[PDB]
Amino acid sequence: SIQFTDGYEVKEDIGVGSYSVCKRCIHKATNMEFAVKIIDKSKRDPTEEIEILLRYGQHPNIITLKDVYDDGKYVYVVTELMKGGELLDKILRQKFFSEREASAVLFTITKTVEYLHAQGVVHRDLKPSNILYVDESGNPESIRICDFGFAKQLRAENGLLMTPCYTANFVAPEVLERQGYDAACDIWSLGVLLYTMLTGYTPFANGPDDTPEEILARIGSGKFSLSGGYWNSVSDTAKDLVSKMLHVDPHQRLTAALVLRHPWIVHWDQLPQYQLNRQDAPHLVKGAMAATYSALNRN
Ligand SMILES: COC(=O)[C@H](C#N)Cc1c(-c2ccc(C)cc2)c2c(N)ncnc2n1/C=C/CO
Ligand code: NA
Structure with a gap:
């Protein structure tokens, strides 16, 4: 002191x-x-953030x-x-980015998220801007999840740390459904990240000009393009994987555990190493991205 x-x-x-x-x-x-x-x-009061960090920042991909x-x-x-800047922005400014590589990136990030969930931690604010590169090797290893400002560990009424596995002490109903809900959102955010990675644009917003109601209507419809233009080039493997991460029904959204068992992630070795055909507008995406979370987060 x-x-x-x-x-x-x-x-x-x-x-x-x-x-x-x-x-x-x-x-x-x-x-x-x-x-x-x-x-x-x-x-x-930053104590939960900090404990979360003390407890888990030993993880190679946690800050x-x-x-x-x-x-x-x-x-x-x-x-x-973190010297390598934000993940997605560096990825977008890469004319020759490939499916193979996107798979390595999502793998690294999901593996990290599967671990947090298993420890009863949900991140809750999993936007692309909170995901930095530590240096400029552009290696997956240099990925870090960085802002746990909104993260929450499952706790017992008595204030005791808990895991999904240990359900054998009782706790509130609407709270397990809450933590299950909040993990589903984490996966969903990785869905939009994946989406943006493959095509160079976000699934629900075109730019920082999109109104929140306009973006919420889109998210609410359940539907988004997985075809035409930039999608042509992408293997059905990945598109399948995206359809399930953004699945409008939170109960139907793939878990991180199930994301890791998808063949896009598993047979990375069968993935194309030639270029994705993506829109080229990093800054427009930054705008859209910010618009999507602003609309989601006004509470
Ligand atoms: C209120 O601001 C934030 O929460 C930032 C975020 N995200 C903090 C941040 C960090 C950082 C993250 C966590 C902790 C405990 C300390 C600093 C950090 C870092 N270690 N390296 C480079 N840029 C960093 N930034 C800036 C990113 C935006 O341009
Ligand atoms: Na770490």
């Missing part, structure tokens, strides 16, 4: 919201760069916590600094 200001030189902002901003920083002793989230304690401090008015959460 001593100091952060002491250990680190603070540099520029890298992200900013009402509850917290992230700044890049330097470990003075060693000269190594790191990110630090600064949470306002009177605005938000790794390196320090923490309680100034008094503020928390300081120090992690590895």
